[PDB]
Amino acid sequence: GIALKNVGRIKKHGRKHLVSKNPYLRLLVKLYNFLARRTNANFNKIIAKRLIMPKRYRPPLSLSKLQYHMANHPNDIAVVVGSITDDKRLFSLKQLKVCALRFTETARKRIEDAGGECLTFDQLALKYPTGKKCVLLRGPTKARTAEKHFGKAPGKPKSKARPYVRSKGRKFEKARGRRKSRAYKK
Amino acid sequence: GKSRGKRSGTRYKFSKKFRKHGECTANKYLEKLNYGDYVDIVCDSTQQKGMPFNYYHGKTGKIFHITKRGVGVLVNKRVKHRIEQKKVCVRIEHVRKSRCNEDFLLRKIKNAELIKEAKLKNEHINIKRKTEGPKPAAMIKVPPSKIITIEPLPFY
Amino acid sequence: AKSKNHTNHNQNRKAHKNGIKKPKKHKFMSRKGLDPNFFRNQKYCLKGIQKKKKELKLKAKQEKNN
Amino acid sequence: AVKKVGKIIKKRTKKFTRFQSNRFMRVKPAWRKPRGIDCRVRRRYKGTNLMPSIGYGSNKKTKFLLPNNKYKYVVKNVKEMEPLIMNHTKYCVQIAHNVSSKKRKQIIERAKQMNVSVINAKARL
Amino acid sequence: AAKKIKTLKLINKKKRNDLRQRTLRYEEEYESERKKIIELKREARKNNCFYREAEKKVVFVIRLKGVNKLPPKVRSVFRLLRLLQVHNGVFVKVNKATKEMLKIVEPYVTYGYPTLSTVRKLLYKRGYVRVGKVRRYARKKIQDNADISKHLGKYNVHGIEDMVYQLYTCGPVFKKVNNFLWAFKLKPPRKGFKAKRHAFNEPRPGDWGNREAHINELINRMI
Amino acid sequence: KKRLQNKNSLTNFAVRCRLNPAYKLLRSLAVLRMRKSILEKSKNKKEKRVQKQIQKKELQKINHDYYKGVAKAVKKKKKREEKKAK
Amino acid sequence: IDNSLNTNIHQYHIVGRAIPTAKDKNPNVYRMCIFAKNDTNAKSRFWYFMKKINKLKKSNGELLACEQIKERFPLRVKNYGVLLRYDSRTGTHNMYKEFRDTTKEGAIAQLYSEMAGRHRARASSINIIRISEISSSLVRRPHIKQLLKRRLRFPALHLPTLQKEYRKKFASKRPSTYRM
RNA sequence: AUUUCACUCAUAUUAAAUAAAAUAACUCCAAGUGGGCCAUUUUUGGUAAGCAGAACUGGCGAUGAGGGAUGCUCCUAACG
RNA sequence: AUUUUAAAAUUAUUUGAAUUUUUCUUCUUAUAAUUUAAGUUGUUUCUAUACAGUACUUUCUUAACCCACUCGUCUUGAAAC
Ligand SMILES: [Mg+2]
Ligand SMILES: [Mg+2]
Ligand SMILES: [Mg+2]
Ligand SMILES: [Mg+2]
Ligand SMILES: [Mg+2]
Ligand SMILES: [Mg+2]
Ligand SMILES: [Mg+2]
Ligand SMILES: [Mg+2]
Ligand SMILES: [Mg+2]
Ligand SMILES: [Mg+2]
Ligand SMILES: [Mg+2]
Ligand SMILES: [Mg+2]
Ligand SMILES: [Mg+2]
Ligand SMILES: [Mg+2]
């Protein structure tokens, strides 16, 4: 015998393949794997990796944050591997160039009315093979509500986690263990 | 039943040494402390206010709080599969400036001038410490009249 | 019938299976309950510094774009 | 033991028979993995039945070849054996069990014209 | 533009000539040291004095026990020395720290001082190399000088005699050369051991001590 | 690349000269001085006795004195202990 | 030349001292003569005795010489006397013995065999003091006096010892032990 | 204290050695367990026990192969 | 389908220098070939001038030599009186 850990076998931890059976997405994965391999640019590698991630790691990005992130990058291209949504809290939109996976109808209409354009990834692969003057962006990955229940258990000292409750009110879990008046707080 | 008090098992730990009783000197009250310093926790039993707990007697930490007569110290402690940071609040008599750091400080100060001189003459300097190694050869002079012969001894 | 009542046999093999973990080494910690009358003054110092910095930056922007 | 004819090597020829199937007739000879404490076959005692493992696997280059040194293809009518006109040196044909004699005569006659061998061209004669 | 191959073809030839010259000077050094030591001792006997020799700086260590039933502190040190199974063998540098590490594991090994010809025989008959990106290494046998120069030619070693030189004497490049080699895997000895239970210095047949210069005879029987 | 047979680096002359570009010269020189000396049976080896007379007489007195001294010291220790035991 | 008859004991001469210090900058020097199987064992015994007798440990000392004394007349027959000290199961004793040989280590080889055969004493429990040579007028043990008469003769009464290929298993006449 | 500007502190031999050191770090969802026993060394009750009760490590259990005639725990050594 | 290449070695003609002074002396400082490089090649015979024979492949049956306690289960522990 011999004294190795994990019998000498190396370990990896992430997702290895697509789960989705959409044929257009499979064509995209083939294309960008080829680009990443034959032009190792650290731009095509990251893209080829990101379009394999599950849904919870491809969050949406709104128009207002898109414009705010590109405020000091005029005449550049923003790249997102999620969806763009409209934002009714914006009053005015600039002229922008954006590539992404999906656009909502309202956001697509608003972008084109201000003089910009929307691109798909097979067009950015054709005009920007190595991602010159392209800026990679992503949306909030820890804003989902499910994340508000994770972490330290609600009942440990100074935990911010939400509990799982039938409903909300003065009659639902607010008496003993939540105020000093009933034997202790938290 | 079982008896686990706060001062249990400290009969010899918390006792003064021979012919060395009495309260502390007056210069102990003139020591300087600053944030981030290394410090030793040594309980002094003749001051009963703000004594540390049994476990921490003899440990070393860093300062995270200074008050009128108190100091907060960050100390590691092993709990069963991990190490936890503990926040220990003690009074000023049970506190001593740590000496575990001084060789590094002297080394830095002294190596500064050697580097400055070597670069001033544009030499090549090596400043890392050297582990004790094998010894070289030498020629040892010895008169024949000085070698004494020995042999095992009989039993008595 | 009686039984065992204590042993910590096999406990540090379990402890070393996932090693002895260590603290996290952050750069800042919270000053919630620490020495007051010193951190309130620090709040004032930092507000003054930020005011000066922002005013200079804003003035530079104002003249640069004209 | 090991059997070798040409370049084809078989690592074992005997079958794996089920433990205790020689002693009780309600136990069939098809292999089942032994589970259960105190088995003496699950624990690899010497002198008893062996277990099958992935080590006895065959060379990838010669895994499905017959002693003919070709692969086998089973056909059901005359039209099914169309693709064999391009690779007539790597494949041999066998006729399905439930085809009549009249259909078999036609299949055999076409296989001869294509220069492909038939494994069982003597049935129902 | 077939000039892309000719400049490389000249570079290889110049590299080969440089290696030849370096090897010849190494041979000179070996003969000179061997002769000087043989004269200093002869002069010491004449002038009523003793000439104590320099001590060794390098040992070769073999493992003697399997992987079952060991205390944890022994397992840690075996891992840090890169000795993982029964009859492995590696070179080790001699310091205060390595001596104390070697005292922990003494009853399970045996070691000694290797000669130049023993080093050469080990490197030519049982010499393997780690090739690849860091942490992906692909054990390969030497067969040529390309792999050596590719990984280690930044410190000016180009070929197998250069690392023989750097191993036999603790040259400036010892950590890299030693770490470049795979751990040696060796046969059992041709006439057996005496008793791995007992020590070399015990008045019985035994094996596990430090056998200073008798290591060469043993590792010629399992090479 | 496909792997091939690993050739014996010591007894296969072509690969031995491939790894060491200096081995041919060293081996040739060794063969030359080997043939010279074996050809000098009954022509040389006759004076090697003369050099024996030259330098063994030089070293003999020193070696003889050294071992004489060691032996005398061991004997003196014996007598010194035997006198004390009485 | 016949390795079936060799013992593996030789004699060595070792010299050593302590590493000089400020309190002692020219320390005493020591020598011994040790019988062992190789030079490494001789050094081990030297440091063992340095520790037991003086206050030297190998870790703060250095070695000056290791010689391996050879013998001058390996075909003349000498008389030897040996002084011992060894441990029994219930105490420790010291002894004097005599041997006849052509080498000192040849006599030490006999001594280890005899002390194992007669007293079950292991090499780990034996300390050797003062091997030397003794004249024939000062021999004490009767079994050595028998061997130094004027005209020593005796018959040979041992049984034959034959090569393995002539050591045949079906004989055709039962052999004789007489051999005159 | 904090903040802003200047100058400068060994690296390719890496501010002491060695290292199939990233086979790392961190989140989520869950199973099965919570009657144990044995050996060297230390050790409590008892005249003692193949008795009862603790400590560090290695094992049996969950594990077969060669040796100890035989043998769950001993020696070598762990399995395509 | 173009690294079984380059290089290295060998042999026979060469262009120059050393030294160890030589039918294996060195330094690819010019062309040709060969393998010791660049993981086995050749010659004879048989099967045989056969179409299933007593030969070859294969499946059963019966010996020898070595080895092999009754499965499932609860249990620290099962071949278990
Ligand atoms: Mg294996
Ligand atoms: Mg089969
Ligand atoms: Mg079981
Ligand atoms: Mg033999
Ligand atoms: Mg043996
Ligand atoms: Mg043992
Ligand atoms: Mg086991
Ligand atoms: Mg027995
Ligand atoms: Mg039998
Ligand atoms: Mg049996
Ligand atoms: Mg169980
Ligand atoms: Mg029971
Ligand atoms: Mg059972
Ligand atoms: Mg019973």
Between residues 59 and 78 of chain F, which touch chain B (CB distance below 8 Å)? 69, 73-74, 76-77
Give dist(CA E101, CA E93) in Å, integer.
Answer: 12
Nearest C-alpha neighbor of G82 from the set G94, G71, G73, G90? G94
Q: How many CB atoms lie within 10 A of CB G98?
A: 17
B-C Cβ pairs (cutoff 8 Å, strict): 24
E204 Cα: distance to centroid of ligand 5 (angstroms): 13
Give dist(CA A67, CA A69) in Å, integer.
Answer: 6
Give dist(CA F33, CA G91) in Å, integer.
Answer: 66
Give dist(CA B29, CA B70) in Å, integer.
Answer: 12
Q: Which amino acid, F31?
A: V
Nearest to E143 among F7, F26, F66 (CB): F7
Chain CA centroid to CA A31, Å: 21
Give dist(CA B55, CA B90) in Å, integer.
Answer: 13
Q: For residue E122, what are its two tokens?
A: 């080990």
Give dist(CA G94, CA G126) in Å, integer.
Answer: 10
B114: left (phi over 0), alpha (psi -120 to 50) or beta: alpha
Give dist(CA A42, CA A36) in Å, integer.
Answer: 8
The answer to whether E28 and E21 are in contact (CB under 8 A) is: no
Query: C15 vs B80: CB contact, 8 Å cut-off?
Result: yes
Q: Which amino acid, B12?
A: Y
What single DSSP character describes residue A156?
B
Query: Residue F7: which nucleotide is closest by CA–C1'?
Result: I39
> CB neighbours of G111 closer than 8 A, spacing ≥ 6?
G82, G84, G97, G99, G128
Give yes or no for E33 touching B (CB within 8 A). Answer: no
D122 Cα: distance to centroid of ligand 14 (angstroms): 66
Give dist(CA G32, CA G129) in Å, integer.
Answer: 11
> CB neighbours of A176 closer than 8 A, spacing ≥ 6?
A182, A183, A184
Give dist(CA E96, CA B132) in Å, integer.
Answer: 6
Give dist(CA A20, CA G85) in Å, integer.
Answer: 89
Per-residue CA distances from A101 to A60, A82, A83 (Å): 10, 6, 6
| Resolution (Å units) | 2.5
The chains found to touch E (3+ Cβ pairs under 8 angstroms) are: A, B, F, G
E221 Cα: distance to centroid of ligand 4 (angstroms): 12
What positions of strand H are covered by protein, i.e. any atom < 7 Å from a CB? 1-3, 9-10, 12-29, 35-38, 52-59, 62-66, 75-80
Nearest to G31 among B147, B152, B153 (CB): B147
Backbone angles phi, psi at E207, to 5 degrees: -135, -20
Give yes or no for B22 touching E (CB within 8 A). Answer: no
Backbone angles phi, psi at C29, to 5 degrees: -125, 160
- CA G34, C1' I24: Å apart? 51
What single DSSP character describes residue E121?
H
- CA E164, C1' I26: Å apart? 24
Nearest C-alpha neighbor of A66 from the set A32, A113, A103, A121? A103
Q: Obtained via which technique? A: cryo-EM
> CB neighbours of B50 closer than 8 A, spacing ≥ 6?
B69, B70, B89, B90, B91, B93, B94
State the sign of the Cα–Cα–Cα–Cα dihedral E31, E36, E41, E46.
positive
Per-residue CA distances from A26 to A29, A42, A52, E27 (Å): 5, 21, 10, 64
Give dist(CA B154, CA G24) in Å, integer.
Answer: 30
Q: Which residue is nearest to nucleotide H59 (CA to C1')?
A: E69
* Strand extents, DSSP E, chain C: none
Q: Is E96 helix (H, G, I), strand (E, B) or coil?
A: helix
Q: Where are the alpha helices (DSSP H) in chain F?
A: 13-19, 23-39, 48-51, 57-85
What single DSSP character describes residue E69?
S
The answer to whether D62 and D70 are in contact (CB under 8 A) is: no
Nearest C-alpha neighbor of E98 from the set E135, E68, E58? E58
Q: For residue D95, what are its two tokens?
A: 């006729």
Q: Which residues touch strand I (CB under 7 A)?
A: D 3, 13, 20, 34-40, 45-48, 67; E 9, 12-13, 16-17, 20, 143; F 1-5, 7, 12-15, 17-18, 21, 24-25, 27-29, 31-32, 36
Which one of G13, G34, G49, G51 would you mutate to disrupt binding with B, by most B Cβ within 10 Å of its Cβ? Answer: G49
Give dist(CA D70, CA E124) in Å, integer.
Answer: 46
What single DSSP character describes residue C11?
H
> CB neighbours of D13 closer than 8 A, spacing ≥ 6?
D1, D3
